[PDB]
Amino acid sequence: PIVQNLQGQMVHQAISPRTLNAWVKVVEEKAFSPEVIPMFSALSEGATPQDLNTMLNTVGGHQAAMQMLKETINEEAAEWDRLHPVHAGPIAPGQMREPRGSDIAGTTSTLQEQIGWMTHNPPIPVGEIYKRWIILGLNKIVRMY
Numbered sequence: 001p002i003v004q005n006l007q008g009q010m011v012h013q014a015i016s017p018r019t020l021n022a023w024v025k026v027v028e029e030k031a032f033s034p035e036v037i038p039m040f041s042a043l044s045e046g047a048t049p050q051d052l053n054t055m056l057n058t059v060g061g062h063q064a065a066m067q068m069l070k071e072t073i074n075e076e077a078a079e080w081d082r083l084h085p086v087h088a089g090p091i092a093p094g095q096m097r098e099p100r101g102s103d104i105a106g107t108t109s110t111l112q113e114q115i116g117w118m119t120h121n122p123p124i125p126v127g128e129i130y131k132r133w134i135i136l137g138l139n140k141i142v143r144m145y
């Protein structure tokens with residue numbers, strides 16, 4: 001995750017093993033019930049796309065629910081690319097590139113690019129955009145059972 005220190009510096013930290021343990025144990029009790037969504041939000045404050053992929057990797061054992069989630073992520077990433085069709089390069093040398101759907105999903109972006117977007121002024125909130133797509137997928141799963 002990104003956290004803000006006392007001087008206002010944005011600081012990256014790797015995801016807590018205790019956050020992953022809590023997320024696994026949460027899913028073991030509430031996998032198909034509405035509470036999985038606010039508990040996912042509670043455990044992903046300031047999460048990068050790489051943190052979010054790490055959280056999903058710890059719970060992939062229920063392959064049919066994970067398949068539904070990954071299909072929803074691919075649908076929302078395709079919709080992002082339709083609204084934001086990528087240019088051949090950035091506006092000028094030294095500017096960050098605009099993220100793709102796969103960059104927001106953390107599959108074609110580096111952690112350093114994710115930190116760059118999330119610590120922009122104002123933030124380019126790729127972690128929160130990916131959380132929205134994950135929460136849409138979690139919604140489909142609890143609707144369906």
Ligand SMILES: Cc1ccc(NC(=O)NCCSCc2ccc(CN(C)C)o2)cc1Cl
Nearest residue numbers: 024027031032058059060061062065138141
């Ligand atoms: C919405 C949703 C619904 C369900 C799920 N995952 C699952 O049910 N995983 C099943 C377990 S994973 C591997 C694992 C972690 C802990 C254990 C041990 N224990 C089986 C006692 O074995 C994921 C999402 Cl994202």
